[PDB]
Design an enzyme around this catalytic site. Structure first.
Site, PDB file in Angstrom:
ATOM      1  N   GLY A  16       0.821  -1.204   0.000  1.00 12.17           N
ATOM      2  CA  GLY A  16       0.000   0.000   0.000  1.00 12.17           C
ATOM      3  C   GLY A  16       0.845   1.240   0.000  1.00 12.17           C
ATOM      4  CG  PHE A  20       2.139  12.727   2.965  1.00  9.18           C
ATOM      5  CD1 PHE A  20       2.381  13.837   2.162  1.00  9.18           C
ATOM      6  CD2 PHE A  20       0.889  12.603   3.562  1.00  9.18           C
ATOM      7  CE1 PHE A  20       1.387  14.802   1.956  1.00  9.18           C
ATOM      8  CE2 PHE A  20      -0.106  13.563   3.348  1.00  9.18           C
ATOM      9  CZ  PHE A  20       0.151  14.656   2.548  1.00  9.18           C
ATOM     10  CE  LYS A  42       2.953   5.675   8.223  1.00  8.39           C
ATOM     11  NZ  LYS A  42       1.723   6.273   8.838  1.00  8.39           N
ATOM     12  CG  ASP A 136      -8.529   6.848   8.271  1.00  7.58           C
ATOM     13  OD1 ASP A 136      -9.598   6.940   7.584  1.00  7.58           O
ATOM     14  OD2 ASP A 136      -7.398   6.797   7.760  1.00  7.58           O
TER      15      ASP A 136
HETATM   16  C1  LIG Z   1       2.474  -0.954   8.795  1.00  5.32           C
HETATM   17  C2  LIG Z   1       1.299  -0.032   8.461  1.00  5.32           C
HETATM   18  C3  LIG Z   1       0.217  -0.058   9.562  1.00  5.32           C
HETATM   19  C4  LIG Z   1       0.132   1.013  10.444  1.00  5.32           C
HETATM   20  C5  LIG Z   1      -0.777   1.023  11.457  1.00  5.32           C
HETATM   21  O1  LIG Z   1      -0.938   2.086  12.331  1.00  5.32           O
HETATM   22  C6  LIG Z   1      -1.642  -0.046  11.574  1.00  5.32           C
HETATM   23  F1  LIG Z   1      -2.536   0.012  12.566  1.00  5.32           F
HETATM   24  C7  LIG Z   1      -1.599  -1.158  10.698  1.00  5.32           C
HETATM   25  C8  LIG Z   1      -0.648  -1.155   9.686  1.00  5.32           C
HETATM   26  C9  LIG Z   1      -0.742  -2.353   8.776  1.00  5.32           C
HETATM   27  C10 LIG Z   1      -1.135  -2.085   7.483  1.00  5.32           C
HETATM   28  C11 LIG Z   1      -1.307  -3.068   6.504  1.00  5.32           C
HETATM   29  C12 LIG Z   1      -1.009  -4.399   6.970  1.00  5.32           C
HETATM   30  C13 LIG Z   1      -1.131  -5.728   6.326  1.00  5.32           C
HETATM   31  C14 LIG Z   1      -1.591  -6.029   4.989  1.00  5.32           C
HETATM   32  N1  LIG Z   1      -1.764  -7.294   4.612  1.00  5.32           N
HETATM   33  C15 LIG Z   1      -2.158  -7.267   3.356  1.00  5.32           C
HETATM   34  C16 LIG Z   1      -2.196  -5.995   2.947  1.00  5.32           C
HETATM   35  N2  LIG Z   1      -1.863  -5.229   4.018  1.00  5.32           N
HETATM   36  C17 LIG Z   1      -2.619  -5.529   1.575  1.00  5.32           C
HETATM   37  N3  LIG Z   1      -2.618  -6.752   0.689  1.00  5.32           N
HETATM   38  C18 LIG Z   1      -2.167  -6.711  -0.578  1.00  5.32           C
HETATM   39  O2  LIG Z   1      -2.105  -7.726  -1.242  1.00  5.32           O
HETATM   40  C19 LIG Z   1      -1.762  -5.567  -1.330  1.00  5.32           C
HETATM   41  C20 LIG Z   1      -2.610  -4.451  -1.284  1.00  5.32           C
HETATM   42  N4  LIG Z   1      -2.341  -3.355  -1.968  1.00  5.32           N
HETATM   43  C21 LIG Z   1      -1.256  -3.287  -2.779  1.00  5.32           C
HETATM   44  N5  LIG Z   1      -1.001  -2.119  -3.496  1.00  5.32           N
HETATM   45  C22 LIG Z   1      -2.154  -1.193  -3.769  1.00  5.32           C
HETATM   46  C23 LIG Z   1      -1.748   0.256  -4.061  1.00  5.32           C
HETATM   47  C24 LIG Z   1      -0.285   0.364  -4.581  1.00  5.32           C
HETATM   48  C25 LIG Z   1       0.029  -0.902  -5.414  1.00  5.32           C
HETATM   49  C26 LIG Z   1       0.177  -2.018  -4.370  1.00  5.32           C
HETATM   50  C27 LIG Z   1      -0.439  -4.447  -2.834  1.00  5.32           C
HETATM   51  N6  LIG Z   1      -0.718  -5.538  -2.144  1.00  5.32           N
HETATM   52  C28 LIG Z   1      -3.080  -7.993   1.278  1.00  5.32           C
HETATM   53  C29 LIG Z   1      -2.444  -8.488   2.521  1.00  5.32           C
HETATM   54  N7  LIG Z   1      -0.832  -6.621   7.204  1.00  5.32           N
HETATM   55  N8  LIG Z   1      -0.477  -6.032   8.368  1.00  5.32           N
HETATM   56  C30 LIG Z   1      -0.632  -4.665   8.254  1.00  5.32           C
HETATM   57  C31 LIG Z   1      -0.471  -3.661   9.219  1.00  5.32           C
END
Ligand SMILES: CCc1cc(O)c(F)cc1-c1ccc2c(-c3nc4c([nH]3)CN(C(=O)c3cnc(N5CCCCC5)cn3)CC4)[nH]nc2c1
Length: 291
Positions: A16, A20, A42, A136
């Site tokens: 994701g 920023f 992140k 959010d």
């Molecule tokens: C570290 C950031 C953070 C900050 C916080 O304050 C919080 F509370 C939580 C998290 C956080 C955020 C996402 C997290 C995932 C996750 N697990 C998957 C995803 N995200 C997307 N996903 C995808 O397959 C995926 C989605 N989008 C993509 N993009 C879309 C836009 C740009 C092109 C790539 C690529 N892969 C399928 C599995 N697991 N643990 C997380 C923990």
């Protein structure tokens, strides 16, 4: 345990990206044999002092939280110093509830939607005890651990209430999720437990639409705003619509008692919205009555 070195972080894939910052799937591999744990990481792209302070505040909030329905904090990587901090969270392969629900809707009935709803209420009640306003809440920000467990994610906008005030006024807000915002958040930038309850109403709406694209909160509010948009911003048309008691419609198939809960969350008066404790109680009883 919470010490993560950049030299052991291995990039696996993008997860994701915001305006920023971004999230990457990494392996933390100190043994360099690919047996390390997979984590979500992140980092910020454009590191201004204010974005840095917000990021440090997000990390302090995450370090303080331990709950079955809140995404697990693992640590931070301080290798490149304060200017290039990395936040390490547990990786959840099922991803967001918005995506999981769209993918698995054929195996997710109303009783299951209410199990997720109860868990979200429980996580929110826990946040309230710490005086944290999430700011959010949306299905894209709730993550799925398994078919029976969801967790509140993205704490990027989370604020701590002042000791003596029931609201936090955000002095300088960037791009905002306007279609999930309470009216006082749109007009006065005031955030409270009651504005999280309004957003919770929108989450419950999202769930009961099963993420049918044409029924999303931006799709419905944009249709309600109308075609004749000349002269004023979308936020202005939205403020007027909500002031005139315009609301997201009842999804067809949505139980009346669930829509009643959404409409109560969407009271214009901050002081007349339900509490998360009452929402958990009501949701649990509706779910018990269904089976
Ligand atoms: C570290 C950031 C953070 C900050 C916080 O304050 C919080 F509370 C939580 C998290 C956080 C955020 C996402 C997290 C995932 C996750 N697990 C998957 C995803 N995200 C997307 N996903 C995808 O397959 C995926 C989605 N989008 C993509 N993009 C879309 C836009 C740009 C092109 C790539 C690529 N892969 C399928 C599995 N697991 N643990 C997380 C923990």
């Amino acid at each position: 345990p919470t010490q993560f070195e950049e030299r052991h972080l291995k990039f696996l894939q993008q997860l994701g990206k915001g305006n920023f910052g971004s999230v990457e799937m990494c392996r933390y591999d100190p043994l360099q044999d690919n047996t390390g744990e997979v984590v979500a990481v992140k980092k910020l792209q454009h590191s201004t002092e204010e974005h840095l302070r917000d990021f440090e505040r997000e990390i302090e909030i995450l370090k303080s939280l331990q709950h079955d329905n809140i995404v697990k904090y693992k640590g931070v990587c301080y290798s490149a110093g304060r200017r290039n901090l990395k936040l390490i969270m547990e990786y959840l392969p099922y991803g967001s509830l918005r995506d999981y629900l769209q993918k698995h809707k054929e195996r997710i009935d109303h009783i299951k939607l209410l199990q997720y709803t109860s868990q979200i209420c429980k996580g929110m009640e826990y946040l309230g005890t710490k005086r944290y306003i999430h700011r959010d809440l949306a299905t894209r920000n709730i993550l799925v651990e398994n078919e029976n467990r969801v967790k509140i994610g993205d704490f990027g906008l989370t604020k701590v209430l002042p000791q003596d005030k029931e609201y936090y006024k955000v002095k300088e807000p960037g791009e905002s999720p306007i279609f999930w915002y309470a009216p006082e958040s749109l007009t006065e930038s005031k955030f409270s437990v009651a504005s999280d309850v309004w957003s919770f109403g929108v989450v419950l709406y999202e769930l009961f639409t099963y993420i049918e694209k044409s029924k999303s909160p931006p799709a419905e509010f944009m249709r309600m705003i109308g075609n004749d948009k000349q002269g004023q911003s979308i936020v202005t048309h939205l403020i007027e619509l909500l002031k005139n008691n315009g609301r997201l419609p009842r999804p067809d198939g949505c139980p009346d008692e669930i829509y009643m809960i959404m409409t109560e969350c969407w009271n214009n008066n901050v002081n007349q919205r339900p509490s998360f404790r009452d929402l958990a109680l009501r949701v649990d009883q509706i779910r018990d009555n269904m089976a």
